[PDB]
Design a protein around this ligand. Structure first.
Ligand code: HEM
Ligand code: HEM
Ligand SMILES: CC(C)C[C@H]1C(=O)N2CCC[C@H]2[C@]2(O)O[C@](NC(=O)[C@@H]3C=C4c5cccc6[nH]c(Br)c(c56)C[C@H]4N(C)C3)(C(C)C)C(=O)N12
Ligand SMILES: CC(C)C[C@H]1C(=O)N2CCC[C@H]2[C@]2(O)O[C@](NC(=O)[C@@H]3C=C4c5cccc6[nH]c(Br)c(c56)C[C@H]4N(C)C3)(C(C)C)C(=O)N12
Lengths: 461, 461
């Protein structure tokens, strides 16, 4: 009955099927689906994830109304996502007043003073990463980036969050390593999540039985592990997220269960994200020696003879920033952004009923010919001081936008840049024979390459 | 995963869809679906009602193996049908040893001695039907057959079962009339039954909450009504099903709840069936004056000057029997017959795994060009002594076949014939302007005409 909504409002889209709505259209993944629909329906289309109506918008003004203008009043929350348990209190899952409160309590965590203080910790692991990478370089076997960057992502996360200093790559069997690395982003296209989309009525049944998409084993270890590194350990001032969160309950307020839910979500949100992007960047660099050479030239020029990177020097590297940005354009890992209309609204011309998920298809927008010349091409120059004025911040949205944008944006940029600097100071990266060209994306619900990125690593003396 | 079954066995059929299986193919009803599939897959095809695999067979030998040969050992039961409650003990729904026991206890009910004893009761209402029909005839407004035959069906059922003598047509507000006539055959194509097919896992949930497809209001009235006409009434020897059922517990055995479940199922099975067929017969007769004239000539010849029909005279009317049979050929109301394989089996060449519903598509078989010359044509002669040897009893199956065939077959034939005799002794039937020609069947899950049959009635003096 909800399947006549877009018909009633006179909005075009793919004709839904009883029960399934439009989900069979996901056979080629989210990105493709969004590309095809944009191409054939233009600026706005409507579709159904089961019985849930989703309105895709592509108009920059419209997008700002949703993400910025009407955030607090109408578009405050993401779609509710499944059986969730105690993780319901995680910032990214929280709603309305719960969210606003957690956002407030957690903002001061990601400030530049706190961030500049985090530099010497996250640098210590630029060194470890080099060390590991060279061990593969002088033995000379084509490297798997996700493995080495994955290892790197975790090391910085553990240490910056809790202070659990561990070489995850060489310690694969470490109890903290086994738990955390299980925490991977959800494929909303897998069988179980498709079942939840078609039968959302089953969610409360799952919630009552303490079933939750976050593996109970993982969340338990940490649940009572954080308990040790507060009461058994830190009960006596260190530089990490946990402290910044401990002292914050020490004046609002923050319960014990909430605090762990945030610690978990910083990993789940932070871990695969940082390493997928760092892996995509290297791919482009390896397939574009000119851009790599030039980046290495900017790095040696700024930090001569392998000087260590600092907060101020990172911000000073223009081409570095251009390369990170162009990569995010091609591979914005979120693919889509989403808000639910709490109430009925009329955004710039069109009426949107309560409960409709309004979706911004970031990937299709990033690769749109009507905003981007040769948008399949990797062209850092797009982002140079001269060109980067012709870039709409609501067409280009790798970190979302508005009050509910990526909270860890600054931290993530900084982290990746530091990783990239140390690595490029010591090594060059070249295509192996197993390297797939062009790169192919997983037809799954995740923006990742269909085969893992394998690259040849060579020292620079 | 069950959707690769027919692929694995190398059996052809329509490719199923995730979850839905093949149910969208029912958009034109059961009969059409079965016709199309036969035409395009030949002798055997496989399809999925949701996740339930159904094997259609059309080979007469094969059909006899299922319906007759392997009934007791392998093909004992129909598919389980939904939330059912106390009606689980109704003969037509019962399984294995429960069924075999009820079949036994109820066989002696439908014998010809009992049946010949039922004649004077069921005749009393041939008279009532004439009386009502004439009231419409001399006022001269085109009659709706279902209404008058419906009324007739019930009158004979109530009286033959319980002894509740009521002119249902002129007593539409009678408390026994309002209850019973709500009891109509299930449309397995309506929304609720489609939901149960796609989510059969919900059935036990429904059963626990005492939800049941037989309306609780209806089943309750009778439940405690039968209680009155046993203890308050018959506790003191009459000719009816109830008695035949009362004395049978008076020697195996029969519980109180069972007895009512059978009383209900004789109505639900008997009521719409008798009147749908009686309505289809009149349609053919009205659209074929030659056949009507001839039938009336056989009736006057056997029962001169309006003599009342008897058991022996009914059996004596060949053309009558030919007309009833030809109509059932065109409109076998069951459309399909079904058995579930209790275990794995290998019927004459092909292997059939446990749980597969094996289905005989009676309607398509009745209208098959390879067994029937001009099978769309209404040609009683098909069934004359000379031709009726060329008729396979497993191609032609209006009352099913084997140990689980229609238990009320003899009673139903007799009842319809008596109705037809009295009616044709007094009246002729002619097409109105609202009469649709040719007749169109409901695209629903029931074999009924898309518009109700309206015919002009005229006295014969
Ligand atoms: C390349 C790396 C990263 C990318 C591309 C990324 C991207 C995004 C995007 C697109 C959103 C959606 C915001 C919206 O709805 O508009 C988001 C939200 C979020 N990100 Fe990130 N992110 C990254 C790294 C991180 C890290 C390292 C953290 C934690 C330290 C983090 C924590 C979050 C949180 C908590 C939210 C939800 C904020 C809220 O709803 O209140 N992210 N991110
Ligand atoms: C024109 C009228 C009727 C037709 C065409 C008809 C047809 C059928 C058919 C095709 C079956 C399926 C048997 C099988 O699976 O092979 C059946 C079963 C049955 N019929 Fe009828 N029927 C009619 C009237 C009646 C009446 C009047 C009664 C009750 C007095 C009745 C009671 C039953 C019962 C109880 C079964 C199930 C037997 C069992 O499973 O043990 N039917 N009928
Ligand atoms: C999933 C939550 C718990 C994690 C949170 C987070 O903390 N992240 C930070 C970096 C990445 C980001 C996140 O994973 O990615 C985010 N979003 C998602 O993962 C979106 C959420 C979806 C979803 C949730 C529940 C039921 C569903 N049925 C279907 Br079909 C989908 C779906 C599609 C799916 N879309 C397209 C992606 C944003 C960037 C938009 C998100 O909210 N993330
Ligand atoms: C339904 C039961 C309780 C009544 C019993 C009966 O007592 N009848 C006597 C005369 C008619 C006959 C009956 O109604 O008709 C019978 N059969 C049916 O009504 C069949 C049963 C079906 C069914 C049951 C449960 C779930 C389902 N999902 C789907 Br898709 C279907 C379905 C299709 C449907 N088919 C094709 C018809 C026979 C003649 C075959 C039957 O068993 N009847």
């Amino acid at each position: 009955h909800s399947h006549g909504l877009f018909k009633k409002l006179g909005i075009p889209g793919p004709t839904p099927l009883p029960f399934l709505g439009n989900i069979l259209s996901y056979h080629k993944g989210f990105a493709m689906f969004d590309m095809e629909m944009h191409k054939k329906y233009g600026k706005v289309w409507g579709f159904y994830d089961g019985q849930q109506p989703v309105l895709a918008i592509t108009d920059p003004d419209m997008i700002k109304t949703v993400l910025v203008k009407e955030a607090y009043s109408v578009f405050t929350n993401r779609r509710p996502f499944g059986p969730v348990g105690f993780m319901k209190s995680a910032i990214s899952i929280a709603e309305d007043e719960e969210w606003k409160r957690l956002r407030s309590l957690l903002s001061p965590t990601f400030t530049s003073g706190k961030l500049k203080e985090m530099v010497p910790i996250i640098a210590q692991y630029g060194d470890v990463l080099v060390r590991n990478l060279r061990r593969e370089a002088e033995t000379g076997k084509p490297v798997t980036l996700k493995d080495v960057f994955g290892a790197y992502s975790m090391d910085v996360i553990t240490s910056t969050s809790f202070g659990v200093n561990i070489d995850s790559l060489n310690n694969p069997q470490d109890p903290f390593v086994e738990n955390t690395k299980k925490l991977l982003r959800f494929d909303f296209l897998d069988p179980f999540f498709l079942s939840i989309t078609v039968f959302p009525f089953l969610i409360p049944i799952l919630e009552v039985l303490n079933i939750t998409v976050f593996p109970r084993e993982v969340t338990n270890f940490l649940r009572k592990s954080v308990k040790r590194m507060k009461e058994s350990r830190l009960e006596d001032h260190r530089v990490d997220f946990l402290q910044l969160m401990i002292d914050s309950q020490n004046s609002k307020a923050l319960s014990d269960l909430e605090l762990v839910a945030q610690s978990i979500i910083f990993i789940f949100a932070g871990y695969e994200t940082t390493s997928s992007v760092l892996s995509f960047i290297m791919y482009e660099l390896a397939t574009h020696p000119d851009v790599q050479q030039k980046l290495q030239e900017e790095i040696d020029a700024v930090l001569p003879n392998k000087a260590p990177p600092t907060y101020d020097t990172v911000l000073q590297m223009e081409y570095l920033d251009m390369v990170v940005n162009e990569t995010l354009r091609l591979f914005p890992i979120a693919m889509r952004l989403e808000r639910v209309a709490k109430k009925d609204v009329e955004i710039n011309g069109m009426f949107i009923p309560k409960g409709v998920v309004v979706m911004i298809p970031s990937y299709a927008l990033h690769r749109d010919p009507k905003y981007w010349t040769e948008p399949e091409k990797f062209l850092p120059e797009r982002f140079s001081k001269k060109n980067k004025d012709n870039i709409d911040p609501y067409i280009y949205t790798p970190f979302g936008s508005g009050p509910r944008n990526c909270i860890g944006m600054r931290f993530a940029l900084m982290n990746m840049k530091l990783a990239l600097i140390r690595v490029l100071q010591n090594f060059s990266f070249k295509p192996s024979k197993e390297t797939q060209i062009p790169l192919k994306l997983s037809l799954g619900g995740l923006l990742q390459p269909e085969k893992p990125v394998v690259l040849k690593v060579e020292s620079r003396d």
